[PDB]
Structure 1
Amino acid sequence: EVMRPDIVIPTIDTIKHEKIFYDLLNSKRGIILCGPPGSGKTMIMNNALRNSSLYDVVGINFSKDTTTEHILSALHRHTNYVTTLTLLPKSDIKNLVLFCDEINLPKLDKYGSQNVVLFLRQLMEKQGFWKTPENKWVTIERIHIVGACNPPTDPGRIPMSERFTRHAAILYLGYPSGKSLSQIYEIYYKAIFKLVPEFRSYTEPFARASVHLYNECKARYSTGLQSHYLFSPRELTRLVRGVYTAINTGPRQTLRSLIRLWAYEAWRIFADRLVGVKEKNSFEQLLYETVDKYLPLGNISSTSLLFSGLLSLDFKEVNKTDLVNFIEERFKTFCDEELEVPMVIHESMVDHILRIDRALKQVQGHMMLIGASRTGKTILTRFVAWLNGLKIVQPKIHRHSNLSDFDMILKKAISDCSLKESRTCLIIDESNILETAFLERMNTLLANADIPDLFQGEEYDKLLNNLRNKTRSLGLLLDTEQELYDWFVGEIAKNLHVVFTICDPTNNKSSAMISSPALFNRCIINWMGDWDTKTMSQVANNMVDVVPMEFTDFIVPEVNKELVFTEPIQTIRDAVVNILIHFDRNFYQKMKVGVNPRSPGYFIDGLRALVKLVTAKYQDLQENQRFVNVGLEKLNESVLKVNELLDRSISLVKSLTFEKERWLNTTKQFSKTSQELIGNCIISSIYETYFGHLNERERGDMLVILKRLLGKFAVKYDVNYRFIDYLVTLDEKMKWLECGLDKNDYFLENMSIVMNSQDAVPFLLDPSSHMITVISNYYGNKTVLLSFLEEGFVKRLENAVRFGSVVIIQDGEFFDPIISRLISREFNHAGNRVTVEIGDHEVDVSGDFKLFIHSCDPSGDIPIFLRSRVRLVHFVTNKESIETRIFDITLTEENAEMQRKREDLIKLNTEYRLKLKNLEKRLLEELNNSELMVTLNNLKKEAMNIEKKLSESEEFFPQFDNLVEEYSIIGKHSV
């Protein structure tokens, strides 16, 4: 009987309040109940109203935006309009009671009035209201009004007019005393421990321990720290219910098992919402003190309590390694079956999976996953729902949408939950709540077990028809409207679990979500927050231990123990992990993020980029060293054969002295570049994935920070490092220059980031709108220009992804959530084919399909969901770009012949250098594939001719230098 919410324990205060509440109802007088949350106003009135056959309860929850039409909608299914107008209840014997919860919550307008408050005082003082659509007076005859509210001193509570409270009797209910709480909850614990008669004598210490833990949590964790640190006896009832569930679905228990189970339940009830690690350690010490002083057992940390029903038929504590392996295999199956994501599983992920599963097993079990973006909220929700067999329904809310689409989605979800008995997990993101009416719908759905506003009139009639048909299909004997709708709301409560995903709790919309009275007292708040450094260490080791890592000498530095969060350093892998974690911490600290959650998406992206880049670079370096070594060996063998033992061979041997010297120099420097390969691979990966949204000065500053922190952990790097020389190839450089890049290294660097992001779609923040023309030149006529602000964009994008054309979407600050599955690269592989879901119907991915997002508005509005997945790249003009453009303009408008000659000479020089480089590549390939002598002589003669041409062409540079020195003053005044 613990799970039934209608149970009460009659104390002195409970029976006193219940009797006076019943007497105030029977006096035909309005009642307003005032008290802090969890006082028991709802409990006493429910208790007083089950013991009467003359009254009926109608539950309305008021939010920040409640209107008169909501109160009317909650009653038309309960009341009949008769013209004797007169709004009588449908029943003829029972009266009606209007439970209006949180009367103080509806806001004032700009002239200091509340609509629903004046409506309620009209309902009680004047006994009726004017029906708006046809302007007639309807007289309320048998409806009473009961108000429940909090004191106005609480935040979010606003003063209430005395013209309202003139007609309403007011009762105040305080929190019960500690002795009363101990008695009530020792009765609860006796009821729980009836299942275990061996430990029936421990009920009173457990109840006193729970009450003491409650009091210490309420005193220590007050609203002054965080806005949601509100504790109530409802928390303790939830703790009791969880204890009963885990006892009922568990094996034979010991006293130590009881202590560990109760501690785990207290962890999942009280300490789920704790933000700081200091408060977590405080709760750990508080649990230790409570156990030591009340119940005189191993470590009782959060991660040391891993209770789960996955590994057996019963709920019991399990080991860490077997649980991790089971979750890894289940997640591999999940990636094979639903969606493929490259995710590795860590211990805090395991704990989050366990607590999400614990909440989802419960009847009326909801969630509020609060934490940073790319933490693993919705993917772990889907994984846990797939483990439980739930059906994932993510609402298809996008731009140019209204309340109608949300109403249809929720109507279909409720119909599938009730009529089709399909168990459903409903995942609501913070970006899927566009208007405050969306919050009103969510609050009405969670507070009650329905939304009375959607199903009214002919919708109510077709609901009745469908439910009679479904009940006759199931063979259940019921005829009345009340029993049928009770079955309806019971099915809704049983087969629907709404999960909330919040990425930025500081935002006003998310603050309204958290502070909503029904979204707070019904949901299970799960503040995962930003990843702790232990999680970063686990994921980093797990995702860099699969690459060939140890190939160079390493000396372990003597560093402070406090700054090292991983295992003690033994090879370069732990050094790499510590370097990446420390740079993530420093990057998020310098950007002044404040108390805002910090997204680990940069860390994961840098980890993956480092993995792929070190793999490619090591493959290229090994191939190049093998080619150089076999070429040098072949040359030495040919020289030895010539010495032991005709003019063409001698000339080829003599001419290749410079190539032999270059090969020897590269062989000598192979050790040097293998020393610095890991360091500059790390630098390149972080420089690609972290500095995309940064200007040149802070990029240089954080590069200095990265170099210092890299030298701290004894990982060598290139002293003469340059990102353009390490990633931007010369072929790509010329392609970009002919496509329309600026000569500035910042723009080439940015486009190098853009092209070298094969996993994340790039965000082109270009106010000048030049990169669109550049990429349109890049892909020729294959490219297509779309926009988020145009009509028919969905069909254009679908045709573009069917054909495989490269897409540029303009107006990036108007992001359309229908392409979210393209944004997160959620691709379903249909054998050799790739398919993706866009909008409402799936579409195929050709394979040459590329996605680009462009936006010409600086300081725009990029959602955190879009912000955390895209390689956002700023294209902001700087010193050198202004100088170059001004110099080019004044040269074109002063002497166009000299400028044309200069640019043609530069193009010819770079083309000759590219031809030279391809020519040494050709010589290396030819010597690796060993007629040939004549071809080699011809290529050597071509190299000599091109070198002489370049030497002849290099005689006009001082004139350009003189022009630079002459027009530098114009350049600097322009800047």
Structure 2
Amino acid sequence: KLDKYGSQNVVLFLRQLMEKQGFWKTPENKWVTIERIHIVGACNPPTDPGRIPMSERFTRHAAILYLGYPSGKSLSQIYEIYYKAIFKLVPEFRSYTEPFARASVHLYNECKARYSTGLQSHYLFSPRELTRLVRGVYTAINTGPRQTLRSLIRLWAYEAWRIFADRLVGVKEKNSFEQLLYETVDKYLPNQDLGNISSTSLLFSGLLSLDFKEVNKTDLVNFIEERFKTFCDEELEVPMVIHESMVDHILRIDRALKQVQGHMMLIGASRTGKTILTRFVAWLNGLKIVQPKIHRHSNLSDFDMILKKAISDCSLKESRTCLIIDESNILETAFLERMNTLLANADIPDLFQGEEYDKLLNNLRNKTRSLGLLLDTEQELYDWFVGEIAKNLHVVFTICDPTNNKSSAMISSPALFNRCIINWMGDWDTKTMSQVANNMVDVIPMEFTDFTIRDAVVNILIHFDRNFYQKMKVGVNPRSPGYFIDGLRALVKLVTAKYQDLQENQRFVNVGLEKLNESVKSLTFEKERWLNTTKQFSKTSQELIGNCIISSIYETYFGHLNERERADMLVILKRLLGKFAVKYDVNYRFIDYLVTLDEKMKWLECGLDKNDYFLENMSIVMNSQDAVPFLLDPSSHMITVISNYYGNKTVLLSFLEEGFVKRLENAIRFGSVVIIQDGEFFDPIISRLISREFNHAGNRVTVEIGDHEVDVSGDFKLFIHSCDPSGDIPIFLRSRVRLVHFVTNKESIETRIFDITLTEENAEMQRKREDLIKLNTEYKLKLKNLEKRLLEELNNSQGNMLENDELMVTLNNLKKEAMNIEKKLSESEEFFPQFDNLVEEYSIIGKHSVKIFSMLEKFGQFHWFYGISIGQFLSCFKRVFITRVDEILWLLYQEVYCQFSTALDKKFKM
């Protein structure tokens, strides 16, 4: 690149060498005249992306030769001689070299044409691929069992897949290649001995046999299963479900990690497991896993250190390392530049220069002789050093969103793109979703149903996740399954928590059935007639599976959605629950279902806002913590709420303070509840603390932070807090984080205008709305409170006199209470559909008012003095009271014009 003025000095330096013939010495300050050195340069058309225009002042000294691609007929001729050489291994198919060479070129010609830089950037094909396929074929032959023609073509098909189609995104193109491969075999190698040529069906491996052979699908999966437990036990502890995609992907990385120079860059979205499979396949190949320990406050020197070691270990210690570089690791431009030098050249020159070159040069001679070969010259030794790196270091890149401009630069970088094997894991397929879901609901709380039952639940969640991304998210399929996994983990944790509580209360009414029968007298036979409740339980249990579906979805998918965006997804979920034979509570409320009246009091005591939205939010934060919650609120009124809840134990930090790095190690050791004040900024180190990763010890539980392994308490809690929604958190965090929005939106106006409208429209029913759900929960808590009071005295007074009678006149008062509930449930089914009839008129009022607030909000954007709060709009809408809907609407437009016209200038009035 070129100075911001736009002048590339590197090129002018060469120009200096071409024209002048010597150059000026940069530190030492003299002229040195270069003798007998020539300058030759290669480059792409400068119409190409990445490419910079060169100065006519430099190119004026050069002879330019444009070399293009050859023939499509010379390519066919050239690779025949390539096949000729490799078929000296399988001489019985010497007549098959020409149709193989003609096919390889055809497959190339077509891939280049069908998958172009019009569809994706990385769709860039060349004769390099042909030669990559040719060698890929030989290596499989040179290390495979004697080959039938059916073997060789499938052998060729597998390499064709790995070279041309692993890079392909999505499925339309990937299917296209399957048929292209079929189309090409049919034209050049006509056999009915072929099978299913799709990558799922042809699996080639040297994991099972000594020879590289196509292996059986069942033989492989079982081989992985025995090895994964081992890798799980031996290395870091994380259990997973091995599925159809994963076996195909494990083989991909296996061939990569085997080849002399092995570079694969993996494009895996997030949570796909791109990083974990890499760790595994590396361990199966016996490659040391090196993972740069970077953070916000890492210098290039740090990364230099990390690289230098892994390079020195690869030649001078013969280590055989696998370097896993994530997109997060490349912090600055130079970091990537370093990575380039490591791939296009097989050394980083700058690390070892001058005296550090002499130290390296010395150490090199020691090990070379030790192994038994002396190398005379300076050049002879370096070429061993580099050649050793080239076979012992393996860099796997894991990039999640190639849409990101930092991750774009990885794929863009020529060094990286040419010497890497590009592989695509960008989405979870519906079959792999179902496979994973199945194994997660393998535990069986459930009971037979209408229609399979577990088969139905999984099909809903796939149809929900597919509807969630379809409706909510914008930007085209860069991001994929994460919530889905957490959604399933929530359901399992929720059904077990609910079914243990359902069977607990069913056990409390069964123990009360034994106690009333023992006694039998005048009122007690009504109590016995409490089969209404006993009959009721079965219908209550029927719905708990589908009720947990909604509750888990709320905890996972809803946290960061709008007032209306929550309700609307719920619709799509409920109608999905409606098609499937799962039974749910039609009068359902997320707050009442998962929040307890004791906790609901506790939260407000701190000073949580009364809003339903803010209740649901707080519920999502607390109730589930299998993962770290990310709280977003402009006014840090939330950061105080959590402070009043955890008290003394509340220790507040922010990613920005100096002492953060250490103060967290002290917070983790002694069970301190921690909130991090600036979520937007986030260093890599917390990262193992965000993913639930630990190393279990004799008594102690250790977590690795940057370097030192520190003890976790378990009474320790973690919260991350942010103030601006504009601030974007890294894809790593966002996926393992439970995102909850405490935001005072324009959507919040629609919700809150109806409450104020109904109090001045039908005061009787908005007043009875509060006590409807209040006395619903209160009387049911008093029903459970008086059942406990009755059982305590029945066990105390059984040998004593009829004291129980003095509680039975209170149980005579309960005949109002038990039946008060029944009185209110009857009028509820009458009240709710009337409530929902009244939502629509106010919606017509509601829709107008947001668009008005949006307009008054937009004035504050143009100018500073033109501010408006939501409260100013509310106060104004109250003034509207102190065809009815039509006149109230026109009362709003009038009152808004009356009050807010004052605070604008004559231009903005109009």
TM-score range, shorter chain: 0.7 to 0.9
Deviation at 1:376, TM superposition (A): 0.8
Deviation at 1:434, TM superposition (A): 1.2
SS at match of 2:558: coil
- Change in Cα spacing, 1:199 to 1:955, as seen in structure 2 (3 Å) is closer
Aligned-partner Cα distance in 2 for 1:960–1:295: 72
Alignment of 1:5-20 (within 5 A): none
Aligned-partner Cα distance in 1 for 2:491–2:405: 37
Deviates more, 1:470-479 or 1:411-420: 470-479
Give yes or no for the alignment of 1:348 onto 2:245.
Answer: yes
Check the 8 A contact 2:294/2:706 in 1, yes or no: no
SS at match of 1:368: strand
Check the 8 A contact 2:772/2:824 in 1, yes or no: no
Check the 8 A contact 1:912/1:950 in 2, yes or no: no
Give yes or no for the alignment of 1:696 onto 2:547.
Answer: no
- Change in Cα spacing, 1:175 to 1:687, as seen in structure 2 (3 Å) is same
- Change in Cα spacing, 1:123 to 1:706, as seen in structure 2 (3 Å) is same
Check the 8 A contact 2:323/2:393 in 1, yes or no: yes
Aligned-partner Cα distance in 2 for 1:763–1:949: 39
- Change in Cα spacing, 1:664 to 1:208, as seen in structure 2 (3 Å) is same
Deviation at 1:138, TM superposition (A): 2.5
- Change in Cα spacing, 1:426 to 1:685, as seen in structure 2 (3 Å) is same
SS at match of 1:737: helix
Deviation at 1:895, TM superposition (A): 25
Check the 8 A contact 1:632/1:660 in 2, yes or no: no
SS at match of 1:521: helix
SS at match of 1:573: helix
Question: Percent identity, aligned pairs only?
Answer: 100
Check the 8 A contact 2:341/2:347 in 1, yes or no: yes
Alignment of 1:236-635 (within 5 A): 236-296=130-190, 297-553=194-450, 571-635=452-516
Deviation at 1:474, TM superposition (A): 3.0
Aligned-partner Cα distance in 1 for 2:163–2:556: 38
Aligned-partner Cα distance in 2 for 1:708–1:939: 39
- Cα deviation digits, residues 372-425 of structure 1 (max 9, x gap): 111111111001111112111111111022211111111111122222211111
- Change in Cα spacing, 1:885 to 1:798, as seen in structure 2 (3 Å) is farther
Deviates more, 1:784-793 or 1:628-637: 628-637
SS at match of 2:40: strand
Aligned-partner Cα distance in 2 for 1:455–1:437: 17
Alignment of 1:871-910 (within 5 A): 871-877=738-744
Check the 8 A contact 1:425/1:498 in 2, yes or no: yes
- Change in Cα spacing, 1:113 to 1:678, as seen in structure 2 (3 Å) is same
Aligned-partner Cα distance in 2 for 1:915–1:773: 32
Aligned-partner Cα distance in 1 for 2:698–2:341: 44
Check the 8 A contact 1:547/1:615 in 2, yes or no: no
Deviation at 1:586, TM superposition (A): 1.2
Aligned-partner Cα distance in 2 for 1:780–1:906: 31
SS at match of 1:292: helix
Deviation at 1:887, TM superposition (A): 15
Deviates more, 1:535-544 or 1:691-700: 535-544
Deviation at 1:134, TM superposition (A): 4.1
- Change in Cα spacing, 1:663 to 1:356, as seen in structure 2 (3 Å) is farther
- Change in Cα spacing, 1:904 to 1:243, as seen in structure 2 (3 Å) is closer
Structure 2 residues without counterparts, runs of 5 or longer: 798-805, 851-910
Deviation at 1:368, TM superposition (A): 0.8
Deviation at 1:261, TM superposition (A): 1.1
- Change in Cα spacing, 1:906 to 1:280, as seen in structure 2 (3 Å) is closer
Aligned-partner Cα distance in 2 for 1:587–1:904: 35
Deviates more, 1:220-229 or 1:900-909: 900-909
SS at match of 1:168: coil
Check the 8 A contact 1:788/1:812 in 2, yes or no: yes
- Cα deviation digits, residues 74-94 of structure 1 (max 9, x gap): xxxxxxxxxxxxxxxxxxxxx
Check the 8 A contact 1:613/1:681 in 2, yes or no: yes
Aligned-partner Cα distance in 1 for 2:788–2:234: 46
Aligned-partner Cα distance in 2 for 1:791–1:418: 39
Check the 8 A contact 1:424/1:497 in 2, yes or no: yes
Check the 8 A contact 1:552/1:674 in 2, yes or no: no
- 1:935 aligned to 810, 813, 821, which one? 810
Aligned-partner Cα distance in 1 for 2:414–2:465: 37
SS at match of 1:909: helix
- Change in Cα spacing, 1:666 to 1:178, as seen in structure 2 (3 Å) is same
Aligned-partner Cα distance in 2 for 1:613–1:958: 30
Question: Who is 2:112 aligned against?
Answer: 218
Aligned-partner Cα distance in 2 for 1:490–1:774: 61
Check the 8 A contact 1:189/1:206 in 2, yes or no: yes
Higher relative contact order (CA 8 A, sep 6+): 1
SS at match of 1:399: coil
Deviation at 1:830, TM superposition (A): 1.6
SS at match of 1:367: strand
- Change in Cα spacing, 1:970 to 1:202, as seen in structure 2 (3 Å) is closer
What is the TM-score normalised by the length of structure 2?
Answer: 0.83
Deviation at 1:886, TM superposition (A): 13
- Change in Cα spacing, 1:437 to 1:655, as seen in structure 2 (3 Å) is farther
Aligned-partner Cα distance in 2 for 1:283–1:804: 55
Deviation at 1:183, TM superposition (A): 2.2
Alignment of 1:64-83 (within 5 A): none
Deviation at 1:767, TM superposition (A): 1.5
Aligned-partner Cα distance in 1 for 2:206–2:524: 73
Deviates more, 1:824-833 or 1:532-541: 824-833
Question: Who is 1:30 aligned against?
Answer: none
- Change in Cα spacing, 1:753 to 1:493, as seen in structure 2 (3 Å) is same
- Cα deviation digits, residues 814-859 of structure 1 (max 9, x gap): 0110111111111122244321111101112122222111111222
Check the 8 A contact 2:449/2:581 in 1, yes or no: no
- Change in Cα spacing, 1:665 to 1:534, as seen in structure 2 (3 Å) is same
- Change in Cα spacing, 1:172 to 1:881, as seen in structure 2 (3 Å) is closer
Deviation at 1:925, TM superposition (A): 8.4
- 2:590 aligned to 719, 723, 748, which one? 723
Deviation at 1:131, TM superposition (A): 2.5
- Cα deviation digits, residues 196-246 of structure 1 (max 9, x gap): 222222111111111111111112112111111111111111111111111
Aligned-partner Cα distance in 2 for 1:814–1:855: 9
Check the 8 A contact 1:744/1:880 in 2, yes or no: no
Aligned-partner Cα distance in 2 for 1:944–1:590: 44
Deviation at 1:623, TM superposition (A): 2.6
**Count of residues in Structure 1 that have an aligned counterpart in Structure 2:** 838
Check the 8 A contact 2:202/2:214 in 1, yes or no: yes
Check the 8 A contact 2:288/2:322 in 1, yes or no: yes
Deviation at 1:666, TM superposition (A): 2.5
- Change in Cα spacing, 1:958 to 1:178, as seen in structure 2 (3 Å) is closer
Check the 8 A contact 2:403/2:478 in 1, yes or no: no
Check the 8 A contact 1:800/1:806 in 2, yes or no: yes
Aligned-partner Cα distance in 1 for 2:831–2:265: 69
Deviation at 1:657, TM superposition (A): 4.7
Deviation at 1:321, TM superposition (A): 2.0
- Change in Cα spacing, 1:605 to 1:469, as seen in structure 2 (3 Å) is same
- Change in Cα spacing, 1:970 to 1:208, as seen in structure 2 (3 Å) is closer
Check the 8 A contact 2:675/2:721 in 1, yes or no: yes
Aligned-partner Cα distance in 2 for 1:241–1:710: 54
Aligned-partner Cα distance in 2 for 1:731–1:755: 14
SS at match of 2:38: strand
Deviation at 1:300, TM superposition (A): 0.6
- Change in Cα spacing, 1:773 to 1:954, as seen in structure 2 (3 Å) is farther
SS at match of 1:812: coil
- Cα deviation digits, residues 76-127 of structure 1 (max 9, x gap): xxxxxxxxxxxxxxxxxxxxxxxxxxxxxxx344434222222211111111
Deviates more, 1:591-600 or 1:285-294: 591-600
Question: Who is 2:715 aligned against?
Answer: 848
- Cα deviation digits, residues 616-669 of structure 1 (max 9, x gap): 22222223223323322432343xxxxxxxxxxxxxx75875983794232222
Aligned-partner Cα distance in 1 for 2:577–2:324: 42
Deviates more, 1:881-890 or 1:673-682: 881-890
Aligned-partner Cα distance in 2 for 1:308–1:761: 40
Deviates more, 1:666-675 or 1:949-958: 949-958
Aligned-partner Cα distance in 2 for 1:605–1:953: 35
